[PDB]
Amino acid sequence: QQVTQLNPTQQTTQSAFLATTVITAQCHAILNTQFTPPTVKPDWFDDLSKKLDSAKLVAKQWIDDLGPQVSASIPSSVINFDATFQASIDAIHELYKADPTASGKDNTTVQQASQIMTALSSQVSGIEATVKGMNKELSDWGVKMQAAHDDLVNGATNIQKTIIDLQTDIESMNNAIDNNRAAIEKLNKDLVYAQVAVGVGIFMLVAGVALTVATAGTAAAVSGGIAAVGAASIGVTWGVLQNQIDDDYDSIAQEQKQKAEDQQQIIALQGLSNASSAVVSAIETSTSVLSDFETTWTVFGNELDDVVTKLNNGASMQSIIMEKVMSDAAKNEWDDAVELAKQLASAKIAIETKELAPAVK
């Protein structure tokens, strides 16, 4: 008993699409990261806030501009190829039916089949180049995000050096943050690499997580951001997220209550870069699965080129009809991949946002 596994083309399409969806979710988590000055605003506050603003700026470039383009391009590459693929395979099968044993470069059936496959391979190479280009746009955006993340991390680290006597409290806080980062990363990565069709009902849960007693918008408050993508068929819930933050942060909540509120804020400052560390991780996953998706097209084009080479070397149409790219199994797999791509392209991704706080005990 296993839910029918995704075929290879379905798999790379869905994983690449979902990974880019995780980037979007983590960009929303950056937008839900916040902190409020203490009653007496320290001299470092404005410049650190500027670094958070810079990370938010880059996050919005993805949400508003690049993200919708990259995410749509993945299923569209499959969908928009279908018409010429169907017409080409149908034309080859008619050529074969009319003369199944036709062979030789001088044979008109061979010449027409070869031209059909050559044109199809050219189209595949164009799609391959589009996917490669989308990975480049992602990479260039990721360089900007990484720079904003690094400066926010460095800025918080520098402020944390300046308040002596809190270095043990800071290490405790950071250990809890690291544990929570890994748990949320796993929720998202398990979805990206799911081997079952995700279907229509994709959603993202985005939260600010209180890292101080002071709640969002009150003096000296800090909220880190987290986000998780889910789907109705496969699962993350608000209760899962709450239970995870309670497990990772419960002791830290008790430690923070022992400190003055301005100190609590300083102890929590690495939390400002939680969400951007999650984005950086999501970029790494997306780059890898987008390369896998590019490879799907490279392999496809090489299979088409191999049939052209065989025809050029005198193979009969009957010999070609037995090649994998010409098989009914391959055609049904392609049809299933088109159906899944249409589902992903039409999916309306719901977003739910909440401000959470770890439970004390």
Side-chain angles (χ1 to χ4, degrees):
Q1 51 182 253
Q2 89 182 347
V3 191
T4 37
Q5 220 91 131
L6 292 180
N7 72 44
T9 302
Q10 289 178 316
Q11 184 67 69
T12 62
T13 304
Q14 184 172 287
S15 289
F17 178 83
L18 290 175
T20 66
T21 302
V22 176
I23 296 177
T24 303
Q26 305 309 331
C27 289
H28 288 281
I30 293 174
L31 298 191
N32 280 271
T33 300
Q34 59 170 291
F35 67 140
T36 297
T39 300
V40 181
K41 178 162 83 170
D43 297 342
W44 52 261
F45 192 92
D46 282 356
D47 287 348
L48 187 63
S49 190
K50 194 159 302 180
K51 299 178 194 300
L52 181 57
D53 289 341
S54 291
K56 291 183 176 181
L57 180 76
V58 179
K60 294 181 77 68
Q61 293 171 17
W62 178 270
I63 290 169
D64 294 347
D65 179 14
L66 183 59
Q69 170 186 164
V70 176
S71 297
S73 74
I74 293 159
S76 289
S77 68
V78 172
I79 297 163
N80 293 344
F81 183 65
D82 185 50
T84 191
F85 185 61
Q86 297 295 327
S88 299
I89 67 103
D90 286 356
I92 297 285
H93 286 155
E94 290 302 319
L95 282 169
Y96 164 79
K97 289 197 295 197
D99 196 8
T101 69
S103 69
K105 279 185 84 172
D106 63 311
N107 177 283
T108 59
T109 296
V110 170
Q111 289 166 3
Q112 292 166 23
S114 176
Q115 191 60 228
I116 292 158
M117 299 299 258
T118 295
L120 196 61
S121 181
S122 180
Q123 294 217 3
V124 166
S125 290
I127 297 166
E128 184 185 358
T130 294
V131 175
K132 184 178 189 178
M134 291 287 95
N135 215 352
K136 177 68 162 65
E137 293 195 38
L138 165 61
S139 176
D140 289 346
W141 175 80
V143 173
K144 291 184 294 187
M145 176 54 70
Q146 181 81 56
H149 171 73
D150 288 348
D151 202 33
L152 179 58
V153 170
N154 194 240
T157 298
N158 279 348
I159 296 161
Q160 290 182 321
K161 288 178 192 294
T162 65
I163 292 84
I164 335 291
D165 108 275
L166 300 188
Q167 313 285 295
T168 292
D169 312 86
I170 286 157
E171 293 173 331
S172 184
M173 168 65 77
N174 292 342
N175 292 336
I177 288 172
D178 289 348
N179 286 330
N180 196 248
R181 286 179 190 188
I184 310 307
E185 231 103 88
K186 177 179 188 299
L187 295 177
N188 287 298
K189 206 172 180 189
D190 287 352
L191 178 60
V192 171
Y193 288 101
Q195 312 239 25
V196 162
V198 88
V200 166
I202 303 171
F203 60 89
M204 49 191 69
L205 306 187
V206 184
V209 181
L211 302 174
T212 53
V213 175
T215 57
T218 71
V222 178
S223 292
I226 64 170
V229 182
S233 79
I234 70 101
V236 73
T237 71
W238 285 112
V240 167
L241 295 181
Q242 184 72 53
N243 292 343
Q244 192 61 57
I245 67 174
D246 288 352
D247 290 342
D248 295 321
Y249 288 112
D250 55 353
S251 47
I252 307 300
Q254 202 111 243
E255 303 166 10
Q256 286 286 64
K257 288 152 68 76
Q258 306 308 121
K259 318 297 297 188
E261 64 176 27
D262 296 359
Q263 288 190 317
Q264 291 181 40
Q265 172 166 75
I266 294 165
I267 292 162
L269 285 180
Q270 295 298 329
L272 298 182
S273 60
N274 284 1
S276 50
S277 68
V279 171
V280 165
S281 176
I283 290 160
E284 179 181 58
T285 296
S286 290
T287 296
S288 182
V289 295
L290 268 173
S291 292
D292 298 344
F293 186 60
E294 178 184 339
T295 297
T296 293
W297 296 101
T298 306
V299 171
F300 198 170
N302 287 358
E303 291 172 352
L304 300 170
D305 295 344
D306 183 71
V307 180
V308 175
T309 295
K310 288 171 174 157
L311 289 170
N312 285 346
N313 300 343
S316 66
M317 297 291 298
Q318 169 64 25
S319 174
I320 280 348
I321 237 59
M322 299 186 296
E323 293 297 329
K324 159 172 151 56
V325 74
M326 295 295 318
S327 63
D328 307 334
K331 205 273 190 178
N332 288 285
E333 288 197 10
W334 170 258
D335 287 352
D336 293 337
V338 173
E339 174 172 44
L340 179 62
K342 287 176 184 173
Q343 285 195 342
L344 298 176
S346 74
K348 291 194 49 215
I349 318 275
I351 305 181
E352 286 185 49
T353 307
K354 290 188 181 187
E355 185 74 14
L356 304 176
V360 160
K361 278 200 155 46

